[PDB]
Structure formats: structure tokens, C-alpha cells
Design an enzyme around this catalytic site. Sequence first.
Site, short mmCIF file in Angstrom:
data_model
loop_
_atom_site.label_atom_id
_atom_site.label_comp_id
_atom_site.label_asym_id
_atom_site.label_seq_id
_atom_site.Cartn_x
_atom_site.Cartn_y
_atom_site.Cartn_z
CG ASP A 7 -54.62 79.34 51.53
OD1 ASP A 7 -55.04 79.86 52.59
OD2 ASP A 7 -54.32 80.01 50.52
CG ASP A 123 -63.41 88.54 53.53
OD1 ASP A 123 -62.30 88.53 54.08
OD2 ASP A 123 -63.92 87.54 52.99
#
EC number: 5.3.1.16
Length: 230
Positions: A7, A123
Site C-alpha cells: 500500500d 468486499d
Amino acid sequence: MIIPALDLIGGTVVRVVQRDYGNDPLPRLQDYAAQGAGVLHLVDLTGAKDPAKRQIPLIKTLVAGVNVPVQVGGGVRTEEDVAALLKAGVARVVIGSTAVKSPDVVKGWFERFGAQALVLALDVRIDEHGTKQVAVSGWQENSGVSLEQLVETYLPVGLKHVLCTDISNVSLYEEVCARYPQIAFQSSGGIGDIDDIAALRGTGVRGVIVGRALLEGKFTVKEAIQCWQN
């Protein structure tokens, strides 16, 4: 395969559960590839917050500096965003919330860019009925569509790559992979130690995204791959 992940915020490698892990993403990625990684994953958190600040120059440098395909996500919301990332040399663009909010639009992207260029990141939280509910983020309510329903929306345009994150497990991946054997599912989240990778062996998942555990020095990419290959 194992898919090591970073990230990035403003050129900085960060941990999410932020924590600063330094400003050396290229040497980190190069060492992941050196240990046998065949694919890498990047999330552009700066771009996710403001598309105008998409870290294109950095992404360009990172892609050029390794010899393996990189998939890149982070607030990819428009056709122009996708095109810009592909132009910068990314192998696959990771699409999240837009794949839930505008399926007809994203279906057009499949027709334009091809199913090999796109990964749909969904998700999932399992509700009290046991249904795999899709949500656009961990902090927003369910969006009213199931994982199966959304996968089946995109099958007619040749969907091949899906990244699934459990935000509510092994059973989850066993179930979806069996139902759609023509899709290569990637798992994300839940990897705390080497045994977590062993547990996903045989579930049918094709790719295992590993981020935090590598930064924390729990195990190495070489060890992860040895585990995956058994």
C-alpha cells in the site's frame, strides 16, 4: 500463486489493519520478485483519495523496475483512469466500488480493454442469513447485491479475475471457487502467519495476496511460495 502487496501513500510504504514502513518501495518489490514472485499487487492510497493525484510517475518507475506483471488499484473510477494506468505499464487494473455502482459502465470496460486487463475487487461480509453480501468498503453498509449475483453480472463479458476480501472464510473461498471454476479467484486479508497460507491450499483459490505479514517479517516471499507449492 503468492501475490506480494504494497500500500502506497505519497511514495511511502504503509501498513493498514497507518504505520510508516519507509520510502523504498522499489527495492522491496525487487526483492519480492527475486524470491520467485510471478505477480505483484499495489494499492495507490493517494489516488484513491484524489484521482487527480494518482501516483502515475511512481507507478511507472515501479513497473519498469521489476520483471513481473503488477496489478494496481486505488479509486479507479473512470475509463480514463483505467487507460492511464495501462499506458503507464501496469498489467492489470483493480476495480472496486465502480464495479458495484455502475455495472453497465464497467461491462463496457471489459469490451474495450479485455478481461485480462481487469481485476474486480469485491468486499464481502457474510450476513446473519449466511449470504455473501457485497459492500463497497469496510465501513459502509451492504449494497444489496450478493457476491454470486455480481459475479454472474460480469460472466457474459468474459470475467476472469476476481479479488475477494472477507470484511465480516476458508469455507467462503471453497464455495465460490467451486461454483465458478472458469474464474481465477484471489484471496485478500486474513494472512497473519504461514499456516494461513497452508489453509488456503486446495480451496481452489488461484492467487493469495500477502501484504502486512511480509512487512512485519513473519515469513518471507520464498517461504510463502514454498508453502503454497507444498
